[PDB]
Amino acid sequence: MHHHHHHGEFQIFAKTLTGKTITLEVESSDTIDNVKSKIQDKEGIPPDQQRLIWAGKQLEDGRTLSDYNIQRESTLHLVLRLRGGSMGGAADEEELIRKAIELSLKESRNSGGY
């Protein structure tokens, strides 16, 4: 029920596991489904095949942008899933989560160093 109007004055930045930078026009409260699909228009990749991991935690499809107060200048770490034959590389489908959290996200965990 996000109305039929349009006012994408606030954009965001998404970075795939491989490190691909993608910019999509979303809302401050945009939902994962909206974020994902929006990506499909950018990389074709279907939302059901796209996963979103942020802050060492996997974003649930029911999550919102305003949930964590995600501004516009945010790096949405996206991980491309793989249902077909395992690529047998760094990122596939499940290993893309633990690694997406240990590579560019671990920084947030490092803050726990006290």
TrEMBL record:
Location in or out of the cell: Cytoplasm; Nucleus
Biological role stated in the UniProt entry: Component of the ribosome, a large ribonucleoprotein complex responsible for the synthesis of proteins in the cell. The small ribosomal subunit (SSU) binds messenger RNAs (mRNAs) and translates the encoded message by selecting cognate aminoacyl-transfer RNA (tRNA) molecules. The large subunit (LSU) contains the ribosomal catalytic site termed the peptidyl transferase center (PTC), which catalyzes the formation of peptide bonds, thereby polymerizing the amino acids delivered by tRNAs into a polypeptide chain.
Alphabetical UniProt keywords: Cytoplasm, Isopeptide bond, Nucleus, Ribonucleoprotein, Ribosomal protein
Natural source organism: Saccharomyces cerevisiae (strain RM11-1a)
Gene Ontology molecular function, alphabetical: structural constituent of ribosome
TM segment ranges: none
Span within the parent record: 2 to 76 of 128
Secretion signal, residue range per the UniProt entry: none
GO cellular component: cytosolic large ribosomal subunit; nucleus
Record carries keyword Ribosomal protein: yes
Subunit: Component of the large ribosomal subunit (LSU). Mature yeast ribosomes consist of a small (40S) and a large (60S) subunit. The 40S small subunit contains 1 molecule of ribosomal RNA (18S rRNA) and 33 different proteins (encoded by 57 genes). The large 60S subunit contains 3 rRNA molecules (25S, 5.8S and 5S rRNA) and 46 different proteins (encoded by 81 genes).
Sequence ranges assigned to domain Ubiquitin-like in this UniProt record: 11-85
Record GO biological process: protein ubiquitination; ribosomal large subunit assembly; ribosomal large subunit export from nucleus; translation
Main localization (coarse): cytoplasm
Family: In the N-terminal section; belongs to the ubiquitin family.
Keyword Coiled coil: no
Protein name in UniProt: Also encodes a ubiquitin protein
